[PDB]
DNA sequence: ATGTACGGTAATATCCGTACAT
DNA sequence: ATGTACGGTAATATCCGTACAT
């Protein structure tokens, strides 16, 4: 199991990988590839060495102070729990942190639409926002630098 | 300038669109295409976060000033990352 | 359903088309079902938002007419 | 000396009446009559029984909660001080108060552009507003009802 | 619809106005007349007071709830009013 | 001075004229000196307000290109 | 020089017609 | 039925010309 950014070559496939939530699977199967190709987002996939068991999406954003946003993260039902989800979060943090070393980014936001995801991101250290930002959790670039010493 | 959009709609829909366009001092061309590409940005870019809130903005600024130490789960995940 | 059809034909830049059709497909609807729905909701918004302006003008002219004489 | 609303008849005249401030005299001599005729404001003048020694202007407003606004008030230099100015303020309050009995108005605002005027309206009971409303002073309709028992 | 406005201006002024009108997806007709009658309301009606401020709005609301008693000067002026 | 002339001709409703010419006279300037000054300040506003949008798009695409590979 | 002002012919852009598709 | 699509002639509205005034 390795994590890699989506390859712009055609015929990539990797059809179905149920994560439990129909919306995330639908986004993976009908939005992710085109939005990566059209530079709307940067899509990263976790799959085996034969060619998918997970994915996440990154997107530059502003809070203006520039940052990066993790909008979607999904893990197949055969990989139950938070483990490889947290590993994918660490991979995304490393990507955002190299990007901050390059062009300057002060933090990473993350979208949490349900309470299970809210608790998941809260167990990883993300700070809960309130009000109109109740579904958004934040983690600074300084903490990501601390993570990789 | 070079492309075009063709659609069909109800005379009720057209009456409403034309009335509001006239209220906006606009043709249905500019009203439709504005109200389209102005609302379409709201969809194709969720690249902005208006944290403005007395508690939320202060939480973000306290995170920027005082950065929380990486938790146990994040350290274990970083250990699981190398491979 | 219960309704019929009557067209509208407008012209844009292909770079604006792109941004329109992408958001249309992302909302799972045709370019027509996007453009028209967005235009209609905008049209209702600036059709009630003008009604409130007319109400304000009416009540202002009422207070103004009462700021004149005793009657 | 009597106070009366502007008469829509032509040839009213009453040329010059210096109050000290060139802006108020200019408004009286080149804006007041037309804006009253065009129903932009309601202009009241204090003059003798022969046909001006003062004036004020009223204008309906919203704070939405409806109210009335005293934008301009001027008293000739031959009538030095606050006396007839305060009497004109009382006349305007009575007008606003009858108007509240008629159509409903919850208060009266007043425009104060300099510190002398600020202190003048503060000596009459107007409450000082702050921030972007620093030049505006308010008096409720209940206090005007109290004034006339 | 029935009246018209005719003015003359610099080619620099016209270039600026036309550029901004194009940015607004508008003709110089609608840009000029909008930017005119939209900014002209700001002049011909000072009939609105946005008290929004933590202290100012609360002062106004405390005046509405607790109405201040008419001062001595206001009572003397009311006495001077009858005549 | 230092500049020349080049006209603009637009058509309105007389009820809109009224509201324009009144504010023009209240600002102590001709209808031309009103219309043109207001249009020019609006034009500069939405000419710098678009420059900031272009700056935002540029820096966003910079962060986006850096969110890709290590180089 | 520039503010105000009227109207006629160039320009535009609003409509239909026409097409095949679902 | 309706979404997508091309272009030709009606409609518009952008220009000048022309006017007297400051």
Q: How was this structure determined?
A: X-ray
| CB of B70 closer than 8 Å to CB of A147 | yes
Which of F68, B78, B46 shows the shortest CA–CA distance to A136?
A: B46
Instruction: Give the CA distances from residue E37 to residues B28, C51, F49, in Å, rounded to whole numbers and listed in that order.
Output: 21, 19, 21
Residue with tokens 């302006």: C53
- Backbone angle region of B2, left / alpha / beta, with phi > 0 → left and psi within -120 to 50 → alpha: alpha
Residue with tokens 């792109």: C18
Burial tier of A71 (Cβ tally within 10 Å: 0-12, 13-18, 19+):
middle
| CB of A20 closer than 8 Å to CB of A3 | no
How many residue pairs bridge chain A and chain B with CB atoms within 8 Å of each other? 107
Cα nearest neighbour of C60 on chain D: D60
Please name the member of E59, E68, E81 whose beta carbon is closest to the beta carbon of D90: E81
How many Å apart are CA C11 and CA B7, to the nearest integer? 12
Are F68 and A42 inside 8 Å of each other by CB?
yes
Instruction: Give the CA distances from residue A32 to residues A4, A46, A58, C20, in Å, rounded to whole numbers and listed in that order.
Output: 14, 14, 11, 18
How many CB atoms sit inside 10 A of residue F38's CB? Answer: 25
Radius of gyration of chain F (CA): 21
**In what side-by-side order are the strands of the sheet with A54-62?**
A2-5, A42-47, A54-62, A66-75, A107-111, A136-140, A127-128
* Cα four-point dihedral sign F59, F65, F70, F71: negative
Query: Which residues 28-47 of F have a C-beta within 8 angstroms of E?
Result: 31-32, 34-36, 38-47
Strands D66-75 and D107-111, sheet pairing: parallel
Nucleotide nearest F35 (Cα, C1'): G3
| Cβ contacts of D38 on chain F, cutoff 8 Å | 22
Task: Give me the half-sphere count of Cα atoms (radius 13 Å) on the Cβ side of residue F36.
Answer: 20
DSSP chain D: -EEEEPP-SS---------S-HHHHHHHHHTHHHHHHTTS-EEEEEE-S----EEEEEEEEE---EEEEEEEEEE-TTS-SSHHHHHHHHHHHHHHHHHHHHH---EEEEE--SHHHHHHHHHTTPEEP-GGGTTEEEEEHHHHHHHT-
| Cβ contacts of E43 on chain D, cutoff 8 Å | none
| CB of D88 closer than 8 Å to CB of D50 | no
* Residue D103 belongs to domain spanning: 1-149
How many Å apart are CA C26 and CA D46, to the nearest integer? 69
Question: Which two structure tokens, joined as six digits, stand for B8?
Answer: 């069909």
Alpha-carbon distance D3 to nearest alpha carbon in chain E (angstroms): 10
Residues on chain D bordering chain F, Cβ-to-Cβ distance under 8 angstroms: 31, 38, 40
Are F22 and D31 inside 8 Å of each other by CB?
no
């Amino acid at each position: 199991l390795t994590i890699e950014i989506l390859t712009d070559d055609a015929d990539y496939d990797l059809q179905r990988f149920d994560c439990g939530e129909e919306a995330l699977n639908l986004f993976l199967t009908t939005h992710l590839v085109r939005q990566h190709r059209n530079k709307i987002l940067r899509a990263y996939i976790l799959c085996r060495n034969t060619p998918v068991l997970g994915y996440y999406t990154l997107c530059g954003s502003c809070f203006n102070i520039p940052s990066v946003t993790l909008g979607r993260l999904a893990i197949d039902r055969s990989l139950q729990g938070q483990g490889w989800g947290a590993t994918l979060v660490a991979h995304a943090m490393k990507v955002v942190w190299s990007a901050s070393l390059a062009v300057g980014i002060h933090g990473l936001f993350v979208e949490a639409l349900n309470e299970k995801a809210h608790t998941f991101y809260k167990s990883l250290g993300f700070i809960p926002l309130v009000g109109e930002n109740e579904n958004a959790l934040f983690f600074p670039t300084k903490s990501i630098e601390l993570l990789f010493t | 300038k070079k492309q075009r959009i063709d659609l069909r709609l109800t005379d009720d829909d057209k009456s409403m669109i034309e009335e509001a366009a006239a209220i906006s001092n606009q043709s249905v061309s500019q009203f439709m295409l504005n109200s389209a590409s102005q609302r379409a940005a709201e969809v194709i870019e969720q690249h902005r976060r208006v944290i403005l809130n007395e508690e939320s903005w202060t939480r973000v600024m306290d995170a920027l000033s005082n950065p929380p130490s990486p938790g146990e789960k994040l350290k274990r995940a970083a250990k699981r990352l190398q491979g």
